[PDB]
Amino acid sequence: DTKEQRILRYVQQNAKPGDPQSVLEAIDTYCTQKEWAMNVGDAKGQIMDAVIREYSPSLVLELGAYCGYSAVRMARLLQPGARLLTMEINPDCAAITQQMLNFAGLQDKVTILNGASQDLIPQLKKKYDVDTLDMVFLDHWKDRYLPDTLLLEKCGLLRKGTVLLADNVIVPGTPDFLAYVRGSSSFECTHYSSYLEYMKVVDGLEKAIYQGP
Ligand SMILES: Nc1ncnc2c1ncn2[C@@H]1O[C@H](CSCC[C@H](N)C(=O)O)[C@@H](O)[C@H]1O
Ligand SMILES: Oc1cc(-c2ccc(F)cc2)cc2nccnc12
Ligand SMILES: [Cl-]
Ligand SMILES: [Mg+2]
Numbered sequence: 001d002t003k004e005q006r007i008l009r010y011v012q013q014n015a016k017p018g019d020p021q022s023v024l025e026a027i028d029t030y031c032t033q034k035e036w037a038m039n040v041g042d043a044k045g046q047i048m049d050a051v052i053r054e055y056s057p058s059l060v061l062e063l064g065a066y067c068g069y070s071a072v073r074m075a076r077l078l079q080p081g082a083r084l085l086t087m088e089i090n091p092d093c094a095a096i097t098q099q100m101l102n103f104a105g106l107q108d109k110v111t112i113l114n115g116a117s118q119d120l121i122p123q124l125k126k127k128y129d130v131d132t133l134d135m136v137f138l139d140h141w142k143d144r145y146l147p148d149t150l151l152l153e154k155c156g157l158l159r160k161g162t163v164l165l166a167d168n169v170i171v172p173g174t175p176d177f178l179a180y181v182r183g184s185s186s187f188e189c190t191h192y193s194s195y196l197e198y199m200k201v202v203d204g205l206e207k208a209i210y211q212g213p
Contacts, residue, residue, distance in 0.1 A: 003035055007067050008096050010034075011103060018105035020076040027069050032198055039069035040139060040167055041197025047205055048137070048165065052077045055163055057134035061124075062086035063117045063148060064140030066093055068100030074137065075106040084110045085128065087117045089140075117144060121151050132159040138177075139167040145177035153213075164208040171196050171203045181208040 001009075007030055015026040024045075031037045040048065048070070052060075056079055065071055065088035075084050088094040094114040101107050111128070113120050117140060124130040136152065138145050145166060152158050169178050169191070181187040187208040196203040 002092070003037060004067050004093060004096050006035065007031070007037060008099060011100065015103065017103055020072050020104045020106060023072050023100065023104045024069065027067070028198075036198050038066060039197055040073065041195075043195045044167065044197065044203065044205060045070070045073050047192045047194055048073060049077060051163070051165055051205075051207065052135075055135060056082075057163070058082045059130065059133055060084045060135045060137065061133050061157075062137045062139065063144070064088065064138075065097040065112060068097035068104075070137065070139060071097060071101060071110055071112075072104050072106060075101065075109045076104070078109055082109070085113060085124070085130075086110060087113045087115065087120050087140075089116045117148050118151060121148065121157070122155055124157060125155065130157065133157050133162055134159075135163045135165065137165050137167070142168065142172055142174040142177075145174045146180055149177065149181070153210075158210045160210065160212040162210040164206075164210065166206040166208065167203075169204050169206045171201055178206060181206065186211050186213065 010030045011023055011026045015022040028042055052074055060074060065086045071086050088097055091114055094112055098112045101110050182189050190207045192205045194204055
């Protein structure tokens with residue numbers, strides 16, 4: 001089996017169904033003690049929690065689901081009726097994420113889209129009945145942050161005030177995206193310094209609020 005399957009099995013063996021906090025703790029324990037994995041982690045997760053609570057988004061899009069850690073993190077803090085869409089290109093990870101959210105009891109708040117963000121983003125308005133997004137969490141391959149941001153704009157999915165929150169802007173880094181949003185009059189940017197998941201290595205999140213065309 002794979003690392004991702006081992007994470008899911010550990011959660012099933014150690015966490016409580018319907019208890020998102022126990023799911024997050026089980027994942028963080030496994031990934032601290034057994035095998036490192038690219039979950040956003042508790043340090044950056046706490047910053048995400050604070051941002052989610054501040055903005056109270058009705059509709060959030062996540063790019064990159066992996067095992068569902070960040071989806072559980074965000075979905076547990078959404079207000080009643082608010083929703084998360086998450087895109088995952090790896091079908092095995094899409095299935096693991098669905099099962100993780102099922103285990104956590106958050107399945108009615110989340111839709112997991114199996115496919116590449118660049119193929120799914122253009123279908124959000126027609127197939128998934130999206131008008132505009134309130135928040136986007138970018139946490140997929142780093143070379144897609146800028147192209148997908150530009151694609152979201154082209155597709156009419158951003159509104160004045162849409163909050164982009166980008167993981168890993170220091171490590172591994174996303175140089176084109178970070179330079180672009182910080183240089184653009186269409187974004188108001190703030191940097192939140194933190195640490196790489198499960199490591200004593202500096203990382204950070206960038207918040208970039210869309211200002212319109
Ligand atoms: N173009 C794309 N569209 C959708 N998912 C993508 C993608 N490129 C990479 N990915 C996925 O992005 C994930 C990065 S890891 C995501 C971690 C997750 N947000 C968490 O914190 O828990 C991987 O599972 C990878 O398969
Ligand atoms: O949070 C992350 C961390 C890393 C990563 C990998 C290897 C290192 F050495 C350091 C950091 C990669 C990621 N890819 C996609 C989404 N999130 C990632
Ligand atoms: Cl951490
Ligand atoms: Mg990340």
